[PDB]
Design a protein around this nucleic acid. Sequence first.
RNA 1: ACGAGAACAUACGUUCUUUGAACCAAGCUUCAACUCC
Length: 51
Amino acid sequence: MKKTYRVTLTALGPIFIGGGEKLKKYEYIFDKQKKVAHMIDHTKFTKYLLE
RNA sequence: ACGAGAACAUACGUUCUUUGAACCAAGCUUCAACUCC
């Protein structure tokens, strides 16, 4: 009766979940030999391309 | 040359007073953002 636990997940392999977003080939992604992929925030980029 | 001739069943008067359409009641249940190239 009402046994509460604390499930601790330790990823052995890679864990990926959902998102609802498909970031395109050009949309906010930059990878080079320093091996990072910065994601640019969404509306600030186009409101900075406004000016 | 009528038991007749005259004579308003009329006057005054709130269908009114008191009163919760209330009470009890989860928009919830089961549900992988996933699948295949």
